[PDB]
UniProtKB/Swiss-Prot annotation, chains A, B, C:
PANTHER family: 2-DEHYDRO-3-DEOXY-6-PHOSPHOGALACTONATE ALDOLASE-RELATED (PTHR30246:SF1), 2-KETO-3-DEOXY-6-PHOSPHOGLUCONATE ALDOLASE (PTHR30246). The gene is eda. It is found in: Cytoplasm. Keywords: Carbohydrate metabolism, Cytoplasm, Lyase, Schiff base. Induction: Part of the edd-eda operon, whose expression is controlled by three functional promoters (P1, P2 and P4), each of which is responsible for induction under different growth conditions. Both P2 and P4 are responsible for the high basal level of expression. P1 controls induction on gluconate and is regulated by GntR. P2 is induced by growth on glucuronate, galacturonate and methyl-beta-D-glucuronide, and is mediated directly by KdgR. P4 is active under conditions of phosphate starvation and is directly controlled by PhoB. This is KHG/KDPG aldolase. It comes from Escherichia coli (strain K12). The formation of KHG is inhibited by halides and substrate analogs such as hydroxypyruvate, tartrate, oxalate or acetaldehyde. KHG aldolase activity is also inhibited by bromopyruvate, which specifically esterifies Glu-45. Activity is partially inhibited by p-mercuriphenylsulfonate, iodoacetate and N-ethylmaleimide. The active site is at E45 (proton acceptor), Q133 (schiff-base intermediate with substrate). InterPro entries: Aldlse_KDPG_KHG (IPR000887), Aldolase_TIM (IPR013785), KDPG/KHG_AS_1 (IPR031337), KDPG/KHG_AS_2 (IPR031338).
Length: 213, 213, 213
């Protein structure tokens, strides 16, 4: 997009795993982001599912500048403008809509919207997008489904998310159309609340390592 | 909606089961609605799949005022206006479209549209809807798929329909996002053909009973 | 459509099988189209997946009067206008979008767009379409899924495509809503190189024959 400083592609090629974080206790946002970076993971998706989500993005955005923090669960222009003002570097949505796609493309940060069908993908392509999230990965039919959908579009790249785990993520990563995946196991809600940051750094390290081949 | 007397939520919380009725002979509409009410089921979805569907709705509307009669298979604004004039108290559609979503929200009765993807759900939410039908439930990937889709939306409630039976409906009912399900087995075409209204009342009773827990 | 000379229905009732052709070398377009016609197959879908796809359509369109050549993989109005100018008699898309449906319906050739959900089908019906492609057939849940989706729409007809083979195509053809299927096995990428057009004609013959009942 003529309006995006950083491309959606760069966001997804930074690493094989994008942690989908849920922050309960704002106080744990920064130490958490640092634990992940120490583990090799710098692209963080902070989902708008808690009251402090936006503040978490703003905090991380300024105290851990080495991290590329973004917003998750962006459902409409209002939230897009909100996380953009808070310092998010990218936004991810479980699905797409014209209003959201129109705000995104006129906005200043890349949006990587999720799709389940070829039509939704084509709608997204109508606005010039090439990077999408495949959601809910598993529910949509996993790897075989994605291969069927991706088939006709060589230039399109995806970030599968939904029911993906250490047990299956290499299966998605092995696809040509897949740049990375969305994993929510790098930050257990328990370890977060418990301030157990070493657990988090270990998970990230292993995630990254287990991605090779 | 500022234009809806009764909410879509009330329609779905009335009972765990919503029978999806197909009427081929107008003469059986009233005696059928009464059989279901006698069995504990008062929310009836009369699908626009037969020539007498609308007349069936109008008849039930006055012959059985204890029943909340609605229309099913509403595909466009024309049919919405039609069943609304005939006395339908609610409308259900296998899918959604902006023309239909706009029409419904300006209209006077609640529309509970079906969705299969997050994008379709988000389009529906753009018009303020919170109650949707999950169709075709099974074909879309059943309970696991619905859980994936529902996940990001705590305030949204569904009414799964499509391939649901006595054998699996408690699985859907057990979900927090599910208020009720669409069942088409309460009115066996035959039973009706053989005017076994007692068969119908028995099925309804059992359906309701088998829903507890 | 008031603007379409030939209907989308005629395109699909011409034969039980519509070959989805991939042409890499323009020199094989005409001899190939003739091989298929000799085998009984006259409706050809030349997919826009190679540089010479459009030239192949133009060549066949003028060289082989006994066939009905169309374009496949049409993703937007630009390509629709392009294949229309090249002589395509119909266009097929893996999905649908309002820009494409609007351009198509204002255009002069029938578009048979693919769908996976009821909503996408309803969007297509909003523009007056009745013939659709079911894609990706298998990935969407095959015959059971299609039956679920087709159910509420008696007037709608489909052309399943995606994972369909000589092993399952009669299963789809057996459905009342199905007029024909998209098969990509009538033209082996190999048969083209060695220039074994007889192999192609044999496959077409067998395809047609194996469709009876």
């Amino acid at each position: 997009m003529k309006n995006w400083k950083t491309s959606a592609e760069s966001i997804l090629t930074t690493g094989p795993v994008v942690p989908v974080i849920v922050v309960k206790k704002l106080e744990h946002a920064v130490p958490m982001a640092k634990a992940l970076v120490a583990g090799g993971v710098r692209v963080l998706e902070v989902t708008l599912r808690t009251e402090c989500a936006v503040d978490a993005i703003r905090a991380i955005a300024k105290e851990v500048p080495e991290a590329i923090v973004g917003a998750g669960t962006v459902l409409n222009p209002q939230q897009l403008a909100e996380v953009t003002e808070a310092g998010a570097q990218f936004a991810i949505s479980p699905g797409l809509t014209e209003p959201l796609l129109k705000a995104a493309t006129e906005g200043t940060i890349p949006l990587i919207p999720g799709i389940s069908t070829v039509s939704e993908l084509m709608l997204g392509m109508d606005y010039g997008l090439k990077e999408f999230q495949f959601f809910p990965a598993e529910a949509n039919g996993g790897v075989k489904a994605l291969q069927a959908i991706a088939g006709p579009f060589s230039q399109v790249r995806f970030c599968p998310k939904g029911g993906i785990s250490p047990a299956n993520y290499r299966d998605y990563l092995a696809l040509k159309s897949v740049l990375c995946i969305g994993g929510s196991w790098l930050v257990p809600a328990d370890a977060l609340e418990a301030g157990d940051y070493d657990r988090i750094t270990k998970l990230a390290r292993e995630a990254v390592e287990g991605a090779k081949l």
